[PDB]
Scaffold this active site. Structure first.
Site, PDB file in Angstrom:
ATOM      1  N   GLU A 281     -12.327  -6.583   6.405  1.00 65.55           N
ATOM      2  CA  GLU A 281     -11.642  -5.326   6.675  1.00 65.55           C
ATOM      3  C   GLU A 281     -10.207  -5.581   7.119  1.00 65.55           C
ATOM      4  O   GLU A 281      -9.304  -4.809   6.799  1.00 65.55           O
ATOM      5  CB  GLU A 281     -12.382  -4.522   7.746  1.00 65.55           C
ATOM      6  CG  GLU A 281     -11.762  -3.162   8.026  1.00 65.55           C
ATOM      7  CD  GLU A 281     -12.186  -2.584   9.361  1.00 65.55           C
ATOM      8  OE1 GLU A 281     -12.781  -3.324  10.172  1.00 65.55           O
ATOM      9  OE2 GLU A 281     -11.923  -1.386   9.602  1.00 65.55           O
ATOM     10  N   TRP A 303     -16.789   1.564   5.772  1.00 67.20           N
ATOM     11  CA  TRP A 303     -15.951   2.700   5.399  1.00 67.20           C
ATOM     12  C   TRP A 303     -16.599   3.614   4.358  1.00 67.20           C
ATOM     13  O   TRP A 303     -15.973   4.562   3.884  1.00 67.20           O
ATOM     14  CB  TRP A 303     -14.593   2.214   4.893  1.00 67.20           C
ATOM     15  CG  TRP A 303     -13.673   1.809   6.003  1.00 67.20           C
ATOM     16  CD1 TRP A 303     -13.371   0.538   6.397  1.00 67.20           C
ATOM     17  CD2 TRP A 303     -12.945   2.682   6.876  1.00 67.20           C
ATOM     18  NE1 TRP A 303     -12.494   0.566   7.454  1.00 67.20           N
ATOM     19  CE2 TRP A 303     -12.216   1.871   7.767  1.00 67.20           C
ATOM     20  CE3 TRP A 303     -12.834   4.073   6.986  1.00 67.20           C
ATOM     21  CZ2 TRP A 303     -11.391   2.403   8.757  1.00 67.20           C
ATOM     22  CZ3 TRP A 303     -12.014   4.598   7.969  1.00 67.20           C
ATOM     23  CH2 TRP A 303     -11.303   3.764   8.840  1.00 67.20           C
ATOM     24  N   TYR A 329      -4.852   2.716   7.430  1.00 63.63           N
ATOM     25  CA  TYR A 329      -4.435   1.415   7.942  1.00 63.63           C
ATOM     26  C   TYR A 329      -4.098   0.459   6.808  1.00 63.63           C
ATOM     27  O   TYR A 329      -4.818   0.372   5.813  1.00 63.63           O
ATOM     28  CB  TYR A 329      -5.525   0.772   8.805  1.00 63.63           C
ATOM     29  CG  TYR A 329      -6.247   1.677   9.775  1.00 63.63           C
ATOM     30  CD1 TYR A 329      -5.761   1.884  11.057  1.00 63.63           C
ATOM     31  CD2 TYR A 329      -7.444   2.288   9.421  1.00 63.63           C
ATOM     32  CE1 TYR A 329      -6.435   2.694  11.954  1.00 63.63           C
ATOM     33  CE2 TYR A 329      -8.123   3.101  10.309  1.00 63.63           C
ATOM     34  CZ  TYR A 329      -7.615   3.301  11.572  1.00 63.63           C
ATOM     35  OH  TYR A 329      -8.294   4.109  12.454  1.00 63.63           O
ATOM     36  N   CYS A 389      -7.428   5.165  14.449  1.00 65.46           N
ATOM     37  CA  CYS A 389      -8.125   5.000  15.716  1.00 65.46           C
ATOM     38  C   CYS A 389      -7.365   3.996  16.562  1.00 65.46           C
ATOM     39  O   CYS A 389      -6.953   4.304  17.678  1.00 65.46           O
ATOM     40  CB  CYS A 389      -9.574   4.585  15.501  1.00 65.46           C
ATOM     41  SG  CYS A 389     -10.599   6.010  15.090  1.00 65.46           S
ATOM     42  N   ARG A 410      -6.674   5.401  20.363  1.00 67.51           N
ATOM     43  CA  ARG A 410      -6.818   6.800  20.757  1.00 67.51           C
ATOM     44  C   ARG A 410      -8.282   7.209  20.912  1.00 67.51           C
ATOM     45  O   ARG A 410      -8.635   7.952  21.827  1.00 67.51           O
ATOM     46  CB  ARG A 410      -6.123   7.721  19.749  1.00 67.51           C
ATOM     47  CG  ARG A 410      -6.692   7.658  18.347  1.00 67.51           C
ATOM     48  CD  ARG A 410      -6.368   8.907  17.556  1.00 67.51           C
ATOM     49  NE  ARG A 410      -7.106   8.943  16.298  1.00 67.51           N
ATOM     50  CZ  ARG A 410      -8.294   9.520  16.147  1.00 67.51           C
ATOM     51  NH1 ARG A 410      -8.879  10.116  17.179  1.00 67.51           N
ATOM     52  NH2 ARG A 410      -8.894   9.502  14.965  1.00 67.51           N
ATOM     53  N   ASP A 413     -15.317   4.047  19.565  1.00 64.64           N
ATOM     54  CA  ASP A 413     -16.770   4.036  19.539  1.00 64.64           C
ATOM     55  C   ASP A 413     -17.238   2.712  20.127  1.00 64.64           C
ATOM     56  O   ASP A 413     -17.045   1.656  19.527  1.00 64.64           O
ATOM     57  CB  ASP A 413     -17.290   4.218  18.109  1.00 64.64           C
ATOM     58  CG  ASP A 413     -18.796   4.418  18.045  1.00 64.64           C
ATOM     59  OD1 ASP A 413     -19.503   4.072  19.015  1.00 64.64           O
ATOM     60  OD2 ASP A 413     -19.277   4.919  17.008  1.00 64.64           O
TER      61      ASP A 413
END
Ligand SMILES: NC(=O)C1=CN([C@@H]2O[C@H](COP(=O)(O)OP(=O)(O)OC[C@H]3O[C@@H](n4cnc5c(N)ncnc54)[C@H](OP(=O)(O)O)[C@@H]3O)[C@@H](O)[C@H]2O)C=CC1
Ligand SMILES: NC(=O)C1=CN([C@@H]2O[C@H](COP(=O)(O)OP(=O)(O)OC[C@H]3O[C@@H](n4cnc5c(N)ncnc54)[C@H](OP(=O)(O)O)[C@@H]3O)[C@@H](O)[C@H]2O)C=CC1
Ligand SMILES: CN(Cc1cnc2nc(N)nc(N)c2n1)c1ccc(C(=O)N[C@@H](CCC(=O)O)C(=O)O)cc1
Ligand SMILES: CN(Cc1cnc2nc(N)nc(N)c2n1)c1ccc(C(=O)N[C@@H](CCC(=O)O)C(=O)O)cc1
Ligand SMILES: Nc1nc(O)c2c(Cc3ccc(C(=O)N[C@@H](CCC(=O)O)C(=O)O)cc3)c[nH]c2n1
Ligand SMILES: Nc1nc(O)c2c(Cc3ccc(C(=O)N[C@@H](CCC(=O)O)C(=O)O)cc3)c[nH]c2n1
Ligand SMILES: O=c1[nH]c(=O)n([C@H]2C[C@H](O)[C@@H](COP(=O)(O)O)O2)cc1F
Ligand SMILES: O=c1[nH]c(=O)n([C@H]2C[C@H](O)[C@@H](COP(=O)(O)O)O2)cc1F
Lengths: 508, 508
Positions: A281, A303, A329, A389, A410, A413
């Site tokens: 990733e 994703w 991203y 995120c 921000r 999880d």
């Protein structure tokens, strides 16, 4: 009546302390630890007695340790009045005469060996245990350290250290049975008077039930606790809150986590993390790839949830191709304010390249305070399959030439995203370090919204029941010319021995 | 031999405890504090004795306090065997008979009055002091609390609380003369073995010399300490580093500060801060104004240094008008990715308005995790007179409808910028709260580069020598319809009593 402590270095899992009349490992720092911990004395006119088996006495080459009196346990070896720093006793209990008499001895340590350790604990002569956990496992052991009786609780766990690519910790166990007051009372009373008005009540210290390894209080060095204690704080002060997903969370605001990348790699050992999924990733971001299928082809499905057809049509992106995620991203990394068409288009040359200018700035102007990578673009937000995120990261060149990373996030999880984010930006920093010719620095993560989805509660409470193991090591097998040239085969993960993987469903 | 404590509430500066036979203030929480602190007992079969002067005994209406034995000191009042909960003694020392006998009394408190307090300390009967500092000063006092003898040191200072717009703290002083070990030693030894390798050595606990109010250890509640301890950490671990300015700094990475805006306003009391300069800069941002002269016309010179002609020509902006700063803070707030021409042009309608969409999002979708304000634009960076220091902020709506703010700051001047940034985003949150109909939440600031310019060393060491005073209060005199309508006259700063202002030169 003086103190008796066990000093031992054993493997993390099988607790093997030795092979073939010697140590399975060679660690210089640990021997120096043994030296300093056994030479520790309050009185200058006293010496510390070290009890060890005959075979252990053989292993050190049958030579005395400086400023210490070695006590050898043997039924064979003669009792020699020649060497004043070495004495032999016929049994272990008679060697505990150091208590009843001989006030020239201040403290007692059991250097042991399996035969000595086992019946030193069995006959309960041991007040304290100094354990050095080593990350070597798959090797062979003919000698082990006996399982620590339940009478002991850990009061300390050190940070993970690296010697010759070997990870190790330092723990202290104590034997616990029994059990200023003015400040503790006054704060409690103010907490009664004032409600949530008092900020101390808004952040409450986690109850023992949800606190990981509660016995360790002032002694939490290990930086996995940085994650595990945040886990606990959310389980305590977390406000039940609805969100865009049908799955509600428990959320708190303004939290942070610190990590050491110098002597270890911040990868969670309380749960088996998929590192390949994380890397693939990250290199996906670095390449600037917005194509979600390229991750799926490599069998990384993280994703897929936000990359489906049904999800895209739901957020008004239905015009888009199945897994095309928009200017997410790595788009914003490689091309900033670039007009986004599709994932198939060639974006080379368009937009601002931050990652390039970042690397260029790091080696050219290291002490610059402006090294920054931001994924948050107000203009492109509506086009994205999901807003950033981990929003922004700043990088820092230390005077000793280490590269440290700050990351603001921000939304976080704690079950899924956070274990990934911790390791992902840890890898990126190590990558940015090699390209710019630096060593890894410290990693600090700042979290705006720290939440736990309600379906992860049973799982994360399970994860909290597991006492942490030392962080693994991560080394690159080759030095790339460009940061995009990194491959999964280039990564060597050394000494990773986590707890069994915990399955948690992602909220879409 | 039992414990004797002084319980008193005095003004922050003149230490006035009373006027005209009564209290200069009415604070409900403080009376409840007095109630709970004097009712605190280990034994259920014992009562706590409360010593007070006759005039004080008059002030409470000459009625007994529940579950407590009041001891009145008078040379006039008869000694009455009628009321069992009240007793009269002729002198203070004879009333200390509670020590030698009467084991039905557990603890002793001196509720005092000036005459009692003064010779209770003078004759040294006092082990502990409970002080409630109140922010009322300019009023009139006929009665004061004697200056605390040097034999006492504070072990605790609470957070600032607000009652009827009055700020107050809770402090504990103790009389100090004299003066697990295993963990303390082990960590120290590891620190000897491992060098800066051990992360614990990279962040060192500040020496007592640079630690503000060292006597308070476990008792620092006050959130000004969040700034003052960060000040100390930089003075300790700060690496000497060159930067774009000719003035080198001492820098550390990855620091944070927490602040409570609910019961107080996070404005530094160890230095007199210019609040007007701060506000006028914030409303300058909100209006989207990039014109540096508009601040100077209002006599705020903070941006003059980066707003000069010589500085602009030096960074290649020489084409620009004198004080025109380019697409800086508030441009990016009100217009994002807007093409910048000059400061005189009309930018209404161009660019993304974050502040507008921020406010719109806050009241419409409070539990959204996406409320964010970013000043960092890679495209517009080169045009700016200086890149954003406070880069990005996230806002949070709590379930009790408070508005909390997180701020990441890439570069932070602890002498100048930080005192401003703490208060500025505290005001902005309060403004955003009123417009959206919320109460103020918590303020958290995350700092990438925390540094102290070497010319501020003498000044900041001076500031560290000052024991903090309770935070002031900030209230708005009117509710505006739009956030741009705020004026300086609308702001009422209540109970701000700082130390003298400290002059520090800005590095350009
Ligand atoms: N990782 C670590 O911290 C440590 C590792 N080790 C390793 O472990 C290995 C050795 O351990 P181990 O195999 O258990 O051997 P030991 O070190 O425990 O030595 C045992 C010897 O002590 C004597 N002894 C033991 N019990 C009694 C008894 N009840 N009465 C009288 N004498 C007794 C015996 O000597 P005798 O038969 O002559 O009478 C016996 O041979 C080595 O490889 C060593 O390097 C050792 C210490 C620490
Ligand atoms: N902010 C706070 O926490 C507190 C404030 N206060 C305020 O302080 C004010 C009053 O205090 P203050 O003016 O100091 O008066 P006091 O409360 O100290 O009362 C003094 C009286 O005690 C008796 N007394 C004092 N010393 C002696 C002695 N050596 N021997 C015998 N008797 C003695 C005398 O009464 P006699 O005439 O019989 O001789 C004297 O008049 C009030 O406004 C009160 O509300 C009071 C307590 C706490
Ligand atoms: C075989 N043996 C037993 C041994 C080995 N590793 C351990 N490791 C730990 N953590 N704890 C032990 N009790 C321990 N014991 C040894 C081997 C060498 C030395 C030794 O050389 N000690 C020197 C230290 C050497 C140095 O500073 O590197 C000293 O002065 O104490 C001690 C014990
Ligand atoms: C005049 N006086 C002296 C007084 C006033 N304020 C103080 N404030 C402080 N911080 N400390 C003191 N010792 C103190 N003493 C008073 C006045 C009222 C009560 C009082 O009503 N006490 C009730 C509490 C009232 C309530 O719970 O609201 C109790 O049960 O103790 C006590 C002392
Ligand atoms: N609600 C929500 N939570 C998230 O964590 C994300 C992410 C990032 C992310 C991070 C990790 C996973 C994930 O699959 N984690 C796993 C499995 C990893 C694997 O096998 O690939 C786990 O540790 O149990 C999935 C998604 C992307 N989108 C997300 N949406
Ligand atoms: N090296 C550096 N440090 C900074 O803090 C800044 C700023 C922001 C800023 C913040 C505060 C001041 C400042 O002069 N503050 C003062 C004076 C306030 C006044 O009298 O108006 C103080 O309280 O000591 C000046 C500039 C803008 N540019 C800066 N450059
Ligand atoms: O790296 C990530 N880490 C993470 O925790 N999330 C989660 C956080 C949140 O639960 C969800 C989306 O947050 P939000 O719904 O507020 O946009 O994605 C996503 C990532 F990409
Ligand atoms: O609000 C501010 N706070 C602050 O600390 N600075 C300082 C930080 C730094 O010392 C200087 C310029 O940052 P840099 O030269 O690293 O880009 O301005 C500027 C502000 F506007």
């Amino acid at each position: 009546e003086k103190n008796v402590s066990i000093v031992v270095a054993a493997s993390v899992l099988s607790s093997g302390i030795g092979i073939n009349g010697q140590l399975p490992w060679s660690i210089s720092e640990d021997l120096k630890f043994f030296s300093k911990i056994t030479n520790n004395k309050c009185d200058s006119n006293k010496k510390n007695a070290l009890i060890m088996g005959r075979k252990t006495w053989d292993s050190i080459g049958r030579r005395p340790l400086k400023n210490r009196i070695i006590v050898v346990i043997s039924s064979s070896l003669p009792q020699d009045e020649a060497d004043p720093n070495v004495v032999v006793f016929r049994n272990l209990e008679d060697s505990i005469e150091n208590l009843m008499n001989d006030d020239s001895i201040e403290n007692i340590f059991v250097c042991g060996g399996e035969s000595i350790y086992r019946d030193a604990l069995k006959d309960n002569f041991v007040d304290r245990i100094y354990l050095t956990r080593v990350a070597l496992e798959d090797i062979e052991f003919d000698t082990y350290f006996p399982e620590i009786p339940e009478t002991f609780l850990p009061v300390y766990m050190s940070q993970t250290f690296c010697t010759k690519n070997i990870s190790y910790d330092f723990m202290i166990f104590e034997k616990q049975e029994k059990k200023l007051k003015s400040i503790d009372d006054t704060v409690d009373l103010l907490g009664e008077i004032f409600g949530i008005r008092k900020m101390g009540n808004r952040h409450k210290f986690p109850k023992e039930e949800i606190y990981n390894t509660p016995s360790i209080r002032f002694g939490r060095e290990h930086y996995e606790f940085q994650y595990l204690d945040l886990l606990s704080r959310v389980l305590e002060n977390g406000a039940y809150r609805e969100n865009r997903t049908g799955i509600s969370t428990y959320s708190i605001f303004g939290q942070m986590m610190r990590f050491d990348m110098r002597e270890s790699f911040p990868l969670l050992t309380t749960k088996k993390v998929a590192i390949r999924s994380i890397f693939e990733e990250l290199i996906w971001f670095i390449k600037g790839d917005t194509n979600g299928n390229h991750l799926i082809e490599k069998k990384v499905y993280i994703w897929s949830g936000n990359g489906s057809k049904e999800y895209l049509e739901r957020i008004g992106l239905g015009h888009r191709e199945e897994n095309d995620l928009g200017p997410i991203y790595g788009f914003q990394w490689r091309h900033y304010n670039g007009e986004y068409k599709t994932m198939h288009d060639d974006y080379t040359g368009v937009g601002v390249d931050q990652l390039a200018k970042l690397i260029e700035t790091l080696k050219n102007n290291p002490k610059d305070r402006r090294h920054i990578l931001t994924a948050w673009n107000p203009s492109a937000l509506s086009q994205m399959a999901l807003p950033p995120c981990h929003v922004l990261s700043q990088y820092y060149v230390t005077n000793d030439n280490c590269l440290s990373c700050n990351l603001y996030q921000r939304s976080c999880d704690l079950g899924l995203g956070s274990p990934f984010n911790i390791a992902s930006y840890a890898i990126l920093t190590m990558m940015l370090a090699q390209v710019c010719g630096y060593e890894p620095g410290e990693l600090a993560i700042f979290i705006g919204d720290a939440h736990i989805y309600e379906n992860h509660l049973t799982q994360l409470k399970e994860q909290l029941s597991r006492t942490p193991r030392p962080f693994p090591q991560l080394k690159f097998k080759r030095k790339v010319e460009n940061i995009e040239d990194f491959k999964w085969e280039d990564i060597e993960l050394i000494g990773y021995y986590p707890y069994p993987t915990i399955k948690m469903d992602m909220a879409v």
